[PDB]
């Protein structure tokens, strides 16, 4: 296939990783060897271009899902960051957060979701995903 796109599923993070874990299971999508899931922690595009990256993080319990980006030869930064107010619910109350934008990615660049409370992100089927697609 010609189109570079990827959609990964969140996974029960081994333990101790402010940066979320993603697994190529479930109803995932990895168009081709032009987008890989390096170390199961980040997506790394091979062909430089303009991609639309996104990610949704669901947690329950000021929780912040940041989409820090790491390119070759440059200190990692911040593409987007979505904040969410702790919901005072009986056990905790589930809340979802969605990020998405158009960014210029050079070859070998990686993107990843980094949250403040990784022990809250709910991993139930379809609650937390991560993906990108090339414009």
């Amino acid at each position: 296939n010609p189109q570079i796109a990827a959609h990964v599923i969140s996974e029960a993070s081994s333990k101790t990783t402010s940066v979320l874990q993603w697994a190529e299971k479930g109803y995932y999508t990895m168009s081709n060897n032009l987008v890989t899931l390096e170390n199961g922690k980040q997506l790394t595009v091979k062909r430089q271009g303009l991609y639309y990256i996104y990610a949704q993080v669901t947690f329950c319990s000021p929780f912040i899902a940041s989409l820090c980006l790491k390119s070759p030869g440059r200190f990692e930064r911040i593409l987007l960051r979505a904040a969410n107010t702790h919901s005072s619910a009986k056990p905790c109350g589930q809340q979802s957060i969605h990020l998405g934008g158009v960014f210029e990615l050079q070859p070998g660049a990686s993107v990843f979701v980094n949250v403040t409370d990784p022990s809250q992100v709910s991993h139930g089927t379809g609650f937390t995903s991560f993906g990108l697609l090339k414009l």
Binding site: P62, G73, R74, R77, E104, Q106
Partner: protein
């Protein structure tokens, strides 16, 4: 052995060592053997505090008043802005990302600190 590496403020690319851009300027095009690396000064609100090879500058930190911060020190094209709490407010963290409000009740606070106490 031969000198197998670029200089301090450089960066190997295309089997050719180029010059990095100076703090305050973002890279615009890599450099050829003869013509050096063309950079360009960071816009307003932006900056780059290091000999980089970045294509986008960083935006000056925001001292969102809603959180109780204030522009302590603007930012140049080579230094990010510096924030601090409002008089009567203090940080909720050592890095100081959000400000609270000096708790009353005996070491006076400094926003960047707190007000200790006892009877």
């Amino acid at each position: 052995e031969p000198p197998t590496a670029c200089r301090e403020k450089q960066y190997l690319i295309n089997s050719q060592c180029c010059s990095l851009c100076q703090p305050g300027q973002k890279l615009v095009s890599d450099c050829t053997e003869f013509t050096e690396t063309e950079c360009l000064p960071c816009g307003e609100s932006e900056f780059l505090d290091t000999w980089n090879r970045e294509t986008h500058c960083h935006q000056h930190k925001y001292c969102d008043p809603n959180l109780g911060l204030r522009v302590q020190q603007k930012g140049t094209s080579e230094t990010d802005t510096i924030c601090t709490c409002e008089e009567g407010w203090h940080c909720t963290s050592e890095a100081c990302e959000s400000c609270v409000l000096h708790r009353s009740c005996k070491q006076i606070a400094t926003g960047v600190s707190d007000t200790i106490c006892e009877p």
